[PDB]
Amino acid sequence: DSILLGATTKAIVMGAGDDTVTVSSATLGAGGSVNGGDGTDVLVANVNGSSFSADPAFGGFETLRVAGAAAQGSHNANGFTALQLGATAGATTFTNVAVNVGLTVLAAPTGTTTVTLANATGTSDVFNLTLSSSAALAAGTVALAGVETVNIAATDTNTTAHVDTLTLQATSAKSIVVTGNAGLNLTNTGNTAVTSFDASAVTGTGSAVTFVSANTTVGEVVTIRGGAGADSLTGSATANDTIIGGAGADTLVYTGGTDTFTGGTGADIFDINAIGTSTAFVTITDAAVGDKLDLVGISTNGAIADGAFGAAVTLGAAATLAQYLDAAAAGDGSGTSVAKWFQFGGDTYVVVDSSAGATFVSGADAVIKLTGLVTLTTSAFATEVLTLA
Ligand SMILES: [Ca+2]
Ligand SMILES: [Ca+2]
Ligand SMILES: [Ca+2]
Ligand SMILES: [Ca+2]
Ligand SMILES: [Ca+2]
Ligand SMILES: [Ca+2]
Ligand SMILES: [Ca+2]
Ligand SMILES: [Ca+2]
Ligand SMILES: [Ca+2]
Ligand SMILES: [Ca+2]
Ligand SMILES: [Ca+2]
Ligand SMILES: [Ca+2]
Numbered sequence: 001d002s003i004l005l006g007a008t009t010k011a012i013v014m015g016a017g018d019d020t021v022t023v024s025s026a027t028l029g030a031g032g033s034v035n036g037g038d039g040t041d042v043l044v045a046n047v048n049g050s051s052f053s054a055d056p057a058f059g060g061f062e063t064l065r066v067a068g069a070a071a072q073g074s075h076n077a078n079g080f081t082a083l084q085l086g087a088t089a090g091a092t093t094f095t096n097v098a099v100n101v102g103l104t105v106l107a108a109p110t111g112t113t114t115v116t117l118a119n120a121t122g123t124s125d126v127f128n129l130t131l132s133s134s135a136a137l138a139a140g141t142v143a144l145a146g147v148e149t150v151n152i153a154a155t156d157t158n159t160t161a162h163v164d165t166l167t168l169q170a171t172s173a174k175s176i177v178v179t180g181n182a183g184l185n186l187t188n189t190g191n192t193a194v195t196s197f198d199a200s201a202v203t204g205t206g207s208a209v210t211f212v213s214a215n216t217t218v219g220e221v222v223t224i225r226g227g228a229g230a231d232s233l234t235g236s237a238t239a240n241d242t243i244i245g246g247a248g249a250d251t252l253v254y255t256g257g258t259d260t261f262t263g264g265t266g267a268d269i270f271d272i273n274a275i276g277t278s279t280a281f282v283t284i285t286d287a288a289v290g291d292k293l294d295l296v297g298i299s300t301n302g303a304i305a306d307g308a309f310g311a312a313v314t315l316g317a318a319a320t321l322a323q324y325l326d327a328a329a330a331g332d333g334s335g336t337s338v339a340k341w342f343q344f345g346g347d348t349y350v351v352v353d354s355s356a357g358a359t360f361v362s363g364a365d366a367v368i369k370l371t372g373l374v375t376l377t378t379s380a381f382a383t384e385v386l387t388l389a
Contacts, residue, residue, distance in 0.1 A: 177198045272366075
């Protein structure tokens with residue numbers, strides 16, 4: 001059953017089953033009560049602040065939802081087992097939130113949604129955020145200070161695919177796990193403790209996940225996992241990122257350091273935006289027919305080949321990696337950068353020469369490793385984009 005109440009004078013009962021009362025005023029009147037009865041019942045606060053647990057006038061409720069044209073401000077979560085959020089008048093804050101209590105956002109709110117837990121002090125703090133809508137949902141900013149694992153469910157209620165959006169502010173989260181069946185473009189700015197982003201369980205044709213690590217710990221191991229969608233995963237220059245797309249047209253971005261890329265099934269694009277060193281470079285584990293290698297961001301001097309540029313550099317039975325690099329960079333890349341490639345020790349390498357001498361210079365010349373023997377003979381350069389043939 002489901003009603004709206006104001007400053008009621010009478011004893012409202014809701015009976016069994018999953019009921020819903022929306023209140024327009026925080027305290028009742030005369031006397032002046034509302035009992036949710038048996039089952040999981042939602043109380044909707046269309047008000048400037050609440051403390052329903054304290055008032056014995058309200059009883060039998062399990063879920064607190066902040067939604068309505070007057071819904072706003074500070075709300076005492078105490079004694080609720082779940083939380084919900086809808087459209088709001090202004091910034092709304094949940095205080096005294098017990099452990100294993102999750103928030104479900106159901107519609108775009110107004111202003112930053114702050115969650116502050118009963119006790120944030122431990123180092124194993126878990127929060128369950130849910131996004132649940134038929135259409136694309138702009139969840140806005142939710143702040144979760146002191147939480148270490150943030151779980152996000154992105155849920156689509158209908159059969160037709162969409163992508164939700166969220167700014168998360170979770171400055172001590174080490175893990176973010178995304179589940180669900182809709183896409184999530186997640187704004188991640190300033191969430192610098194994050195070393196594991198796992199959206200791998202996500203499900204549709206295009207439940208597309210976007211993520212960019214804000215991590216700046218020098219020499220960190222960061223793990224970034226995409227889902228079934230056409231995902232857009234960027235690491236950190238600071239970090240040794242392991243990035244893995246799922247199914248679908250994934251874009252994996254290189255920024256610096258020792259990175260390990262695996263675009264799974266589908267036409268993946270490995271977008272190389274940094275030069276790297278001779279030790280800190282990107283290894284692409286599963287480069288296959290259809291995958292692309294976007295070298296626009298290493299065209300230091302001009303813009304790459306543009307041909308089908310495809311005869312492997314060949315050296316002797318025991319030529320060294322150092323030798324093959326120097327050999328590949330032999331030409332002049334001062335006015336115009338050039339691509340070459342070779343196969344050493346069972347793996348395939350691609351080079352960009354941006355220099356004078358026949359030394360591969362660690363700084364401005366670039367190497368990219370590809371696990372296995374992959375023949376790039378027949379494969380062609382689009383703009384500065386190599387499509388594997
Ligand atoms: Ca009930
Ligand atoms: Ca109560
Ligand atoms: Ca109940
Ligand atoms: Ca939908
Ligand atoms: Ca904590
Ligand atoms: Ca946090
Ligand atoms: Ca994917
Ligand atoms: Ca990196
Ligand atoms: Ca993929
Ligand atoms: Ca692929
Ligand atoms: Ca690029
Ligand atoms: Ca050179």
